[PDB]
Amino acid sequence: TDTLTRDNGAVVGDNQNSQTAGAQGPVLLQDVQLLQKLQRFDRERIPERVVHARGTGVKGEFTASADISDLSKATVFKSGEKTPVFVRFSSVVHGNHSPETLRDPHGFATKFYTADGNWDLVGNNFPTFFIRDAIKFPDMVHAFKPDPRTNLDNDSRRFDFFSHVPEATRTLTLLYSNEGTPAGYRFMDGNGVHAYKLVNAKGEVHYVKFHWKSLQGIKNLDPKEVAQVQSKDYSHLTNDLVGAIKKGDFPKWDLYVQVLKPEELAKFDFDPLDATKIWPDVPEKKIGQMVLNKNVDNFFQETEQVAMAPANLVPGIEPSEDRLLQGRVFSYADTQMYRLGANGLSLPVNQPKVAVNNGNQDGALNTGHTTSGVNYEPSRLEPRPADDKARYSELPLSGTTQQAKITREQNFKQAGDLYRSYSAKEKTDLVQKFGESLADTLTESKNIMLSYLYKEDPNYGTRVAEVAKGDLSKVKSLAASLKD
Amino acid sequence: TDTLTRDNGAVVGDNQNSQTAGAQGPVLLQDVQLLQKLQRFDRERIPERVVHARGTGVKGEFTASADISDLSKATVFKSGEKTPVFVRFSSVVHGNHSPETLRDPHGFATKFYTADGNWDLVGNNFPTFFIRDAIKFPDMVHAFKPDPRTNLDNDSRRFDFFSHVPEATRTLTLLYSNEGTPAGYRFMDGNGVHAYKLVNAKGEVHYVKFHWKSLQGIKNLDPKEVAQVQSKDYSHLTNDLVGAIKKGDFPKWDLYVQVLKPEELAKFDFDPLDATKIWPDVPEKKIGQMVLNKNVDNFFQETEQVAMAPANLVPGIEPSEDRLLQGRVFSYADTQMYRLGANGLSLPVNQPKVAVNNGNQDGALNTGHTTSGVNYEPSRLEPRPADDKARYSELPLSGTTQQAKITREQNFKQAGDLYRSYSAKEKTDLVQKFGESLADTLTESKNIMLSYLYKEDPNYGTRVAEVAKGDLSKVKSLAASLKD
Amino acid sequence: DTLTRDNGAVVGDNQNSQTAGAQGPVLLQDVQLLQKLQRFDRERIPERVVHARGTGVKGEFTASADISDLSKATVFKSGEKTPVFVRFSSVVHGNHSPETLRDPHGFATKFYTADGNWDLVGNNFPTFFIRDAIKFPDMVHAFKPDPRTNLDNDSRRFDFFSHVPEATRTLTLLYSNEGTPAGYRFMDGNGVHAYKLVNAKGEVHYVKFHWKSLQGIKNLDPKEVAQVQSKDYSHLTNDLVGAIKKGDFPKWDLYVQVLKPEELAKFDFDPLDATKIWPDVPEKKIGQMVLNKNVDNFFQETEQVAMAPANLVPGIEPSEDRLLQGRVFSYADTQMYRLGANGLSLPVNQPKVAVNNGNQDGALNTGHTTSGVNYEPSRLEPRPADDKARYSELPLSGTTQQAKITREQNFKQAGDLYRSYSAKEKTDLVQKFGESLADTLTESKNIMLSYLYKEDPNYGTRVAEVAKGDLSKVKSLAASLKD
Amino acid sequence: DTLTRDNGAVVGDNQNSQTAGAQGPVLLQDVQLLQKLQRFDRERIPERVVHARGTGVKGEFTASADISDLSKATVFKSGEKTPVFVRFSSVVHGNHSPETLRDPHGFATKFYTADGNWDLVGNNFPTFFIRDAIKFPDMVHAFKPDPRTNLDNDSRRFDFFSHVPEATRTLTLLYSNEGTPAGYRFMDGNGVHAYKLVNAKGEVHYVKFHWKSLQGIKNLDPKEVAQVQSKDYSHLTNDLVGAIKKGDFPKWDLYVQVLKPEELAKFDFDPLDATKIWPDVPEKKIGQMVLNKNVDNFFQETEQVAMAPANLVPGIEPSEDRLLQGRVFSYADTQMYRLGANGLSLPVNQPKVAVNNGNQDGALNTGHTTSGVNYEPSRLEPRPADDKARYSELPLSGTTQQAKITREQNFKQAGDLYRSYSAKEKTDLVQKFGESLADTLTESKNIMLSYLYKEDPNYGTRVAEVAKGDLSKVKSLAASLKD
Numbered sequence A, B: 001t002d003t004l005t006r007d008n009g010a011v012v013g014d015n016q017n018s019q020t021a022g023a024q025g026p027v028l029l030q031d032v033q034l035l036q037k038l039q040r041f042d043r044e045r046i047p048e049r050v051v052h053a054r055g056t057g058v059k060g061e062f063t064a065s066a067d068i069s070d071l072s073k074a075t076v077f078k079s080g081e082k083t084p085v086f087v088r089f090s091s092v093v094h095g096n097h098s099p100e101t102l103r104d105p106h107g108f109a110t111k112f113y114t115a116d117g118n119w120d121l122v123g124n125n126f127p128t129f130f131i132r133d134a135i136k137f138p139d140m141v142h143a144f145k146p147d148p149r150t151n152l153d154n155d156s157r158r159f160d161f162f163s164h165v166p167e168a169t170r171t172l173t174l175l176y177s178n179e180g181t182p183a184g185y186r187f188m189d190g191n192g193v194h195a196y197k198l199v200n201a202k203g204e205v206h207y208v209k210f211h212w213k214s215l216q217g218i219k220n221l222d223p224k225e226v227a228q229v230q231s232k233d234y235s236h237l238t239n240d241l242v243g244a245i246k247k248g249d250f251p252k253w254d255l256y257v258q259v260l261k262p263e264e265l266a267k268f269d270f271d272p273l274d275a276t277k278i279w280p281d282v283p284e285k286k287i288g289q290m291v292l293n294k295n296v297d298n299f300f301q302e303t304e305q306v307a308m309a310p311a312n313l314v315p316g317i318e319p320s321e322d323r324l325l326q327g328r329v330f331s332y333a334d335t336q337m338y339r340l341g342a343n344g345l346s347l348p349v350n351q352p353k354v355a356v357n358n359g360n361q362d363g364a365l366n367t368g369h370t371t372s373g374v375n376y377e378p379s380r381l382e383p384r385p386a387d388d389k390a391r392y393s394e395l396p397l398s399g400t401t402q403q404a405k406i407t408r409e410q411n412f413k414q415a416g417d418l419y420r421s422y423s424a425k426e427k428t429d430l431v432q433k434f435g436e437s438l439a440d441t442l443t444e445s446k447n448i449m450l451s452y453l454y455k456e457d458p459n460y461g462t463r464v465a466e467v468a469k470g471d472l473s474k475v476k477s478l479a480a481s482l483k484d
Numbered sequence C, D: 001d002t003l004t005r006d007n008g009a010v011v012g013d014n015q016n017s018q019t020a021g022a023q024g025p026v027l028l029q030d031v032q033l034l035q036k037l038q039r040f041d042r043e044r045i046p047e048r049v050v051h052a053r054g055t056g057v058k059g060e061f062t063a064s065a066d067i068s069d070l071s072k073a074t075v076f077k078s079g080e081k082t083p084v085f086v087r088f089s090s091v092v093h094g095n096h097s098p099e100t101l102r103d104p105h106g107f108a109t110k111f112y113t114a115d116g117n118w119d120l121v122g123n124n125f126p127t128f129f130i131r132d133a134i135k136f137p138d139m140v141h142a143f144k145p146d147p148r149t150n151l152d153n154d155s156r157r158f159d160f161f162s163h164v165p166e167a168t169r170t171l172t173l174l175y176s177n178e179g180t181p182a183g184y185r186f187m188d189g190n191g192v193h194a195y196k197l198v199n200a201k202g203e204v205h206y207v208k209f210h211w212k213s214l215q216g217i218k219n220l221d222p223k224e225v226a227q228v229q230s231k232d233y234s235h236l237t238n239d240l241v242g243a244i245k246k247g248d249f250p251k252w253d254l255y256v257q258v259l260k261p262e263e264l265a266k267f268d269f270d271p272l273d274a275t276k277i278w279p280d281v282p283e284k285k286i287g288q289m290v291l292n293k294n295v296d297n298f299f300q301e302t303e304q305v306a307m308a309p310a311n312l313v314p315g316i317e318p319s320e321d322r323l324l325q326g327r328v329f330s331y332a333d334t335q336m337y338r339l340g341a342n343g344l345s346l347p348v349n350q351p352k353v354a355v356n357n358g359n360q361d362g363a364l365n366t367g368h369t370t371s372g373v374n375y376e377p378s379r380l381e382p383r384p385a386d387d388k389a390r391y392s393e394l395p396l397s398g399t400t401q402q403a404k405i406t407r408e409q410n411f412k413q414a415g416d417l418y419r420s421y422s423a424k425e426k427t428d429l430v431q432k433f434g435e436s437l438a439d440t441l442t443e444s445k446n447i448m449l450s451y452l453y454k455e456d457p458n459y460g461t462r463v464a465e466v467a468k469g470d471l472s473k474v475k476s477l478a479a480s481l482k483d
């Protein structure tokens, strides 16, 4: 077999014994194989993601199947176009080897390696989120994560924060339902959550929501099943997916879009760009199908180093003015400059399948081969012209610069409708899980949280208020003042 | 209450809404509060420890109680001397938020903030280790850790490695016994593993092993109890410890030493500086007592950032020539330069309780206030004399520089001793756990592993061979050729 | 006091490594050798991407006027005295580059105010070369040494600048003798952009800041530059540190130029264009600064200071100048990298008021947190905002867009500047610019010369001769340019 | 080709940021503005702790002797052609520091051999100032600019060197005109230390390496230094890059001086003392190097190359020189920080042979691993060692120790050097040392003078004059110094 070498290519003569000053003597500083193997070892780890640290990556392909040229000019949506993908599924709060049975929303991020560049659709199984403005994301994550004093879960903290956040009511209803503990990533849907802005070749815009429909169906664990699985397997989602792909049982999802024109936004009773809302009566249209059929070759180089970011957009796809999405356009590229580095987008899993041509340079571990003296634009010696067809869409403005919440909140209606859509057994599990989680919250926050659940549906609030030992008369009088 | 501020101290006007271009417009880049909060958030995480990433830190005090001036000049051992400590307990292989029920050795690292500087005793509950030379450490960890292709446990990998490592037999016997799954950190002992060299005021040396004897007793979980605990609690060791301290029930450990003179080592049939060995008949002497009685204030600032390293030594305590230990003198300080930074030892939790006076300077995030022009030694303007009493001890040398295994291995005797010391019930649990783990290893490595167990004790090897489905006749013939 | 390791243990020998016998190899277990070398091996951090070469000093600012109608900031309250940290610098070259190299010179002032830290990061030139921060990286890459060799190559800047008529004014300032100061004490400081001051009623004013040197202005001419460089590559640092050591403390008066929001539309140029001065707006004195103390340690203080236009206090906000808007992001961003997440907690960067927020962890966090409340809002440990500190509201119209400003006036002020120079000052300018332009590609060179010609026919004509451009092509090119 | 963003998407407008209307603020969603500024903000990495100012060129080495009796290394096989990367540098000052400043000049060569990459990291000076690596951080700290002001302050290095008599020989080379070369092309290079060469029979030889310039040696005297500095702060880079552009490729012959292990105890000095040359050992030529190609990109190649004495191939090992021993640790260590754990996988650092080991992960890992076997040994995917590559064995005796070498001889070789200088060179040497020593504290100054006086009474006497030392004290201190 080929000889073991050091990183400079030199063969190693003994990989079992350190060089010592005699049989009973100390180790020498000059043993370069010892030093190099330990300095590499000592530097293998990089920071985990600040959220969604626990994840599983797989590869597959997406094939478009409809004519949506009237909605978007992006080549990924052209009927019959087959684009390779990289998908990273994940939980949200806990560290990287945390039990996959822990209750949480699950991430569903798809990197499309399109012919116009890489587009990332960074979604979750839940179609709505807990907040509507990215300025609260650091606050929200800090409240959800383990207590900073102990590294132990302490749910009284998320309910202190969330008692000030009535808009979280619908998504907390998902979290504490059995949708919070899936049986496999193959048995969950995916949603973009926000409305994205699709732009056609005439410069016209449509606001669109994306949904991945599982062709395997939806399968969740109930709290007693969660405990049985957790007893022997702390990686059941990863085992399920990797194992399925090894057996050739490739999971698939159909992609659907819901569409609104800019002039329809103001007609609704809720704000269509509020990330805490679904669009209940807008029809869905199928535009493609993705199949995930290949495992990764190396977890660290692919799954750990993949950089998913809503900022990775192609002409024809832009962010909407959803205020949650707006901060996401900054945050992922920013964190990835730190987690990976300035040259993170040049790693194999992050590279586009098209040419990159710009003046960005240098930075740590630059692996390029540059020969030109022109790293500026414009240049008449080595021009790099822009493409006028790729200019951003123009959105009309009015009012003033401002710091004010959106005007139509409707914080409790959709939560109530979701609660009522649940089977009797689903409601029972949601009520017992939410109540157990809320039981030792401070009394003031506890009765305020329970007022939101009661305003969503009196049966929901009454039952969680019994489990959590809240004060039902205070819950009802607080709920009476809440506005629809 | 005090107004929320930005990091430059300027008060914040609205922490709930980002600044937007009208009520329906996009978010502005000039919103410095949004951008600061997101950039700080985006940079919260640092690399986890390459091993022992899952850990719990607490604080307490150690009080010495014997006259060991004959063995060491170090102040921490002076009778009645009280020294504050920081202890970090941990598992080894998996990451943060991995289940604390996972089978593994457990770390027991004590930072003593002595009156002569900080001394770290970085030990484990197991008194022996799997390998005896630090050049194999990276290989050993890579074999134990989850498969690099999938991030899932795959014990065929560790047994392909350990089939070439007959010296791992005794510690794999501890690993697969119920000592591999403790009921609490308070119910385990701690050991230095290596002999350390204590030096007295005359410059004379003694080799000593350290043992923390639990005053709460030893309590382990058997396989069925592990699954039951894991079903509901993935942080059972942290909860147990933080819990006890909150209730005032402070865990204690008596510190004992085993002592051998330099001239006695050659008389043993095993090498006393072999990390795979205990010293079976050397008497123990109690030298002090440690009580852990305070939880940390902030997990990140203290438990995550603490830097435990065998290199943090004080005059009177030095590393022995144990070849595993020698590598550890280099590796912890090296990985901390990366994980923390060049200024990592100036963080609050890592600072000594005595003055630091040297020419080490600059480096990222230097928080000092230097006024001198003298950052070199020697200097006649601002001298920094050495202390001739702190010169290292002189060890006699013989032979040549070399790369060769130690001359006495005795790889199976102590492992058989350990097996035979176990109760019938403990034997059954060991055999079932080891055999289930080994069952899908490649046949050649599996029968070689079994031969090691059979040579330790024929009953051990026969029973694990039945559970693992190895070939007994091949096991017996391979064992017949093994040497004692 | 005895020499120690970083753990506080005393060192027994700091002159000899531990070796295996008199003729033998060095031992891995010598922890003093390893810890000194590992710290030494990690002393350096990335230099600033621009302005790497700099000098820092400390002093104090005292406000002297009632400007409460313009800003509610406590720093400007007449009589208020505020400690300052100032960093002066060059722009293009590395940290030990000669201080005589031709460049704009930075003048950044960190005010440790009673409302928090406010940084006024300006330059001695009152105008900049570009007017939209999206071009900053390109501009800097064209100015810096050639990426192939690390050697100055002025044809690269004129290839870029031939597309940028808006750089005419400041290029005139660069190639003049103001491009090579005699001391930092002998130069003015300008904020360049208009900032928006907001008073206690919420009213806004657009203001320009100017530091007037009370030592006067003193530039070196070309011949004096080579003379000084021959023996001194740190002449600016030497002058300032030496002057403070002798007790000759340099002082600057701070002046403001003021405009109301409804006045911006009435000029022939865009008042928020960073390549423009405000020629006819009167100046008012609002305070004075004295720099009277040298630093204790260059690295801890001068190298680690983090100056950023985003360090704002109530009463001061960015204007819509498109150059400034980019700077509000870039400084804080690069400091997260060059220093780290906890860079603003280093001694030189800390404010003199408490910091109260949920920002946490990050590399080398030196705090002492005990609370479980790292989120807002909380009813257990609230951290209320102050409604009085809400940002001002600017009226908007039109659409989101990617389009240059409409009033450019790229040559007029460039010409006024040229013609304002003495005959000798003009001669030096023409020769420095023309020598720098000489080997630019012919198309860029004659386009550059057209911008100078459009500014002032004598200017363009004299540089064309030195630089060897085609006078007739310059004149026809200039014919097609708009004032 | 069309400009793109880093994800490959085409840019529609690289001239204007996206704003909220023509007079409105910039938008956070303009991903091109943010990605360009984020990349620009992170361009710089930490400069080398020493030798930050450098120039890199490429070339080829051709072996021309049969030295298989001394080393089994393929690089030295007669007729063997190996590609090289060479980086020349100054030592003490930061990037863009004047290349005329007085220092030793680095001469590092990376040989991309058929057995792996071998780096010969040398200098023009054949000796060094100190002899144990434990003092290296102290020495560098004393040599660099004062930590309080970032200005050169030569009193600091003499405070330090007044305790270091062994630096006399190299301080003599430093203050001579060898300290200011006219080009890297006109300077020799030396490995300084003895290296251990090992042949195919396991036999060892101690060897010194010397690169003989085939352009001759060309220095600048103090008056010429000032002239070049007045106008050129990159004279060495210019000279070397320009020479190669013209086709005038510089050449160096490689020579070795050989000693057997039993010969080291014979001499009156220690042959592994880095402050010593080997005066009477003869030199044999073993090959020639020609540098004939410039780099394509300065940052990717010259800034990112990783030169380290730890990059060894079979046939070559460190000797027991105590300064060399620390260098085996420190270069790889600083490169783990300056570059990263994956720094040896960058294009310029990669070997021309396959790398096969279980080193993995780390920041920005660009590999394409498929195996699950990242440990050794393995019976599934074995990675056997080669017994012929085992390290050589050195006989030991004594005990572990912290004690200076015994045969110091700190002054004789320095005096020898001085006496070989022409009258011109002696006067230049004397004026510079004296001028640098001038404001040192009297006690250190007179002790430095004693060392010079002990090397040679005229040296001592002539430098004590310029520096204003006290000759009677110098002579009585010198009286007591031993040979």
Ligand code: HEM
Pocket: A048, A049, A050, A051, A052, A055, A088, A089, A090, A106, A107, A108, A109, A122, A123, A124, A129, A133, A134, A137, A192, A193, A194, A275, A306, A307, A308, A324, A325, A327, A328, A331, A332, A335, A336, A339, B038, B042
């Ligand atoms: C609709 C709401 C959101 C969804 C669906 C979502 C989804 C996700 C997913 C799936 C990932 C993991 C991607 C991967 O597998 O690598 C992730 C990571 C992340 N998210 Fe979000 N998230 C949302 C809200 C936010 C917000 C509001 C912010 C901040 C402004 C944010 C910041 C981050 C960060 C910093 C990471 C780590 C990325 C990395 O290190 O590569 N997210 N998110």
Ligand code: HEM
Pocket: A038, A042, B048, B049, B050, B051, B052, B055, B088, B089, B090, B106, B107, B108, B109, B122, B123, B124, B128, B129, B133, B134, B137, B192, B193, B194, B275, B306, B307, B308, B324, B325, B327, B328, B331, B332, B335, B336, B339
């Ligand atoms: C007797 C054998 C060993 C014992 C008892 C042991 C114990 C420990 C413990 C208790 C910790 C965690 C300290 C904490 O809580 O921060 C640790 C971490 C670590 N150990 Fe060991 N270990 C052993 C062998 C080794 C060897 C041979 C090496 C390498 C030569 C090594 C390298 C490391 C590293 C790099 C870390 C991470 C340190 C950090 O990031 O702060 N260990 N070990």
